[PDB]
Amino acid sequence: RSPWCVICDPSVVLALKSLEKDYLPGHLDAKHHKAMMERVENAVKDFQELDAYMGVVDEATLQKGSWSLLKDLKRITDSDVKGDLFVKELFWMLHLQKETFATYVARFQKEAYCPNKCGVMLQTLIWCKNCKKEVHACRKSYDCGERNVEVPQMEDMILDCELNWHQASEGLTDYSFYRVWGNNTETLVSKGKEATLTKPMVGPEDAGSYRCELGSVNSSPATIINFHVTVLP
Amino acid sequence: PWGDELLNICMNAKHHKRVPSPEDKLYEECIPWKDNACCTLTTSWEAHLDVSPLYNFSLFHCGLLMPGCRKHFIQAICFYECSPNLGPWIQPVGERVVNVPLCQEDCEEWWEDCRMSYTCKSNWRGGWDWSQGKNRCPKGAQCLPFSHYFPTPADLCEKTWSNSFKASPERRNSGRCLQKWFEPAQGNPNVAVARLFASEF
Numbered sequence: 001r002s003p004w005c006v007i008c009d010p011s012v013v014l015a016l017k018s019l020e021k022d023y024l025p026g027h028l029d030a031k032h033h034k035a036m037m038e039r040v041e042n043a044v045k046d047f048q049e050l051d052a053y054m055g056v057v058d059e060a061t062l063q064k065g066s067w068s069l070l071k072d073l074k075r076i077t078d079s080d081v082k083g084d085l086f087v088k089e090l091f092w093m094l095h096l097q098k099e100t101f102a103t104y105v106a107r108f109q110k111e112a113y114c115p116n117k118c119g120v121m122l123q124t125l126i127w128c129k130n131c132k133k134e135v136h137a138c139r140k141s142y143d144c145g146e147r148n149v150e151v152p153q154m155e156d157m158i159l160d161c162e163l164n165w166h167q168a169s170e171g172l173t174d175y176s177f178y179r180v181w182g183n184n185t186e187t188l189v190s191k192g193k194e195a196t197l198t199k200p201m202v203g204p205e206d207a208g209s210y211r212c213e214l215g216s217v218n219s220s221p222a223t224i225i226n227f228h229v230t231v232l233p
Numbered sequence: 234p235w236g237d238e239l240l241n242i243c244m245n246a247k248h249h250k251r252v253p254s255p256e257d258k259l260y261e262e263c264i265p266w267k268d269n270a271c272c273t274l275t276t277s278w279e280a281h282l283d284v285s286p287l288y289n290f291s292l293f294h295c296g297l298l299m300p301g302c303r304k305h306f307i308q309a310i311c312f313y314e315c316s317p318n319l320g321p322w323i324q325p326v327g328e329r330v331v332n333v334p335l336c337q338e339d340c341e342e343w344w345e346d347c348r349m350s351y352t353c354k355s356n357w358r359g360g361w362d363w364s365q366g367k368n369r370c371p372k373g374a375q376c377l378p379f380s381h382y383f384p385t386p387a388d389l390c391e392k393t394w395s396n397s398f399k400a401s402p403e404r405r406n407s408g409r410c411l412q413k414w415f416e417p418a419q420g421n422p423n424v425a426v427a428r429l430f431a432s433e434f
């Protein structure tokens with residue numbers, strides 16, 4: 001039993017207050033104001049339409065919904081509609097809006113929630129229960145798995161650590177590239193914002209293991225990828 | 234006299250290391266135990282998973298928790314899985330743990346940060362709808378603030394984990410209650426409680 005996430009938008013709550021104070025006096029009998037608003041508050045305080053709902057939304061989804069609703073609400077108030085005509089249009093409208101919004105939510109859940117396929121993506125969500133906006137950690141396997149690379153001798157080796165979702169992840173730091181030696185030591189060979197490591201004009205000495213670590217504001221890494229390099233003589 | 238039998242050991246449940254020892258790397262919230270742990274790297278990672286394979290108990294049952302709250306629960310797991318200082322409270326049900334005294338701050342903070350999150354039950358140890366492989370709230374169980382179902386910190390500490398923990402009136406650094414998390418920089422404050430309790434003077 002949860003609020004319609006749309007009320008986490010400030011313009012919506014102000015539109016609704018404006019409806020109460022600016023629209024109701026000229027358009028609905030005074031004896032109905034009290035109960036009308038109770039009914040509207042409750043329309044927004046429970047969202048029954050919801051793939052189990054997790055109670056969260058991204059800013060984009062919230063905006064897509066709020067913009068839809070605000071537009072249609074002002075369409076009602078601009079029309080100057082009154083009395084039972086008004087009452088009926090409004091609740092009718094709200095119902096339809098909730099449905100449309102439901103759709104936007106299911107879309108968000110299946111398409112924009114934790115879209116990473118490995119590693120850990122941090123993403124800001126808004127919790128509908130309390131309008132509180134915080135960062136969620138999207139955890140998929142610890143790994144992102146090995147790359148086989150074979151490079152013709154004396155061409156350039158490019159190791160790409162970038163995954164689709166990185167540009168959208170929040171709280172990321174740096175791409176660390178390590179070479180992994182046969183005696184179980186490692187050398188940090190680069191550490192920076194560049195998602196690829198380029199090594200030009202390669203020879204056999206460049207064969208072996210490399211590991212990429214994409215760092216996070218948190219303790220542990222967001223993405224780990226291992227590369228095994230064979231140099232073709 | 235001194236219960237050394239009861240010190241520096243790991244319980245025999247399915248995931249635990251047979252004996253404690255240091256780890257090169259443990260994930261996030263389990264880092265404080267890397268000095269000497271009953272959890273492997275894998276275990277420490279698994280603890281952070283939504284519906285972690287360790288228990289197949291879903292925390293999302295009333296919707297995703299606030300991250301602050303989720304953090305507390307993960308720490309609870311890290312502690313249970315990683316602590317080498319649990320001997321005095323180990324008992325067989327193949328072993329489990331009963332009424333580990335968690336310091337009041339640990340239960341208070343936990344409770345505080347989970348107030349805004351939602352659950353449907355106050356005794357999580359059983360009575361769930363189990364059909365999907367994961368628990369869902371049973372027919373007609375209302376999703377409401379944690380502060381409704383767990384009116385007190387004590388309720389939360391104790392009942393979520395089937396009385397694995399006891400909310401202690403003792404506070405932190407009394408020498409007589411354990412912390413479910415501690416800053417790794419500052420060194421493990423639970424070692425000496427174990428010792429006290431092994432002897433249990």
Ligand SMILES: *[C@@H]1O[C@H](CO)[C@@H](O)[C@H](O)[C@H]1NC(C)=O
Pocket residue numbers: 181182183185
């Ligand atoms: C380990 O092996 C690498 C590569 O063979 C070598 O350069 C390095 O000196 C060795 N490191 C140590 C610490 O012995």
Ligand SMILES: *[C@@H]1O[C@H](CO)[C@@H](O)[C@H](O)[C@H]1NC(C)=O
Pocket residue numbers: 286287288289366
């Ligand atoms: C958790 O789920 C897995 C995968 O479906 C299952 O095989 C396993 O028995 C469950 N784990 C525990 C600890 O019960």
Ligand SMILES: [Cl-]
Pocket residue numbers: 316317318421423424
């Ligand atoms: Cl400990």
